[PDB]
Structure 1
Amino acid sequence: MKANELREKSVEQLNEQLLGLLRDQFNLRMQKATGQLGQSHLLSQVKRDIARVKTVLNQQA
Structure 2
Amino acid sequence: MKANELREKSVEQLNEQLLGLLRDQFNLRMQKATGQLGQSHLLSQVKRDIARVKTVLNQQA
Normalised by the length of structure 1, the TM-score is 0.99
C-alpha distance after superposition, 1:6-59 (max 9, x if no partner) = 000010000000000000000000110000000100000000000000000000
Question: Gaps (5+ residues) in structure 1?
Answer: none
Q: Which runs of 4+ in 1 moved over 2 A?
A: none
CA distance in 1, matches of 2:29, 2:23: 10
Identity of aligned residues (%): 100
Unaligned 5+ runs, structure 2? none
> TM-score w.r.t. structure 2 length?
0.99
Distance (Å, rounded) in 2 between the aligned partners of 1:48 and 1:10: 20
Name the count of aligned residue pairs: 61
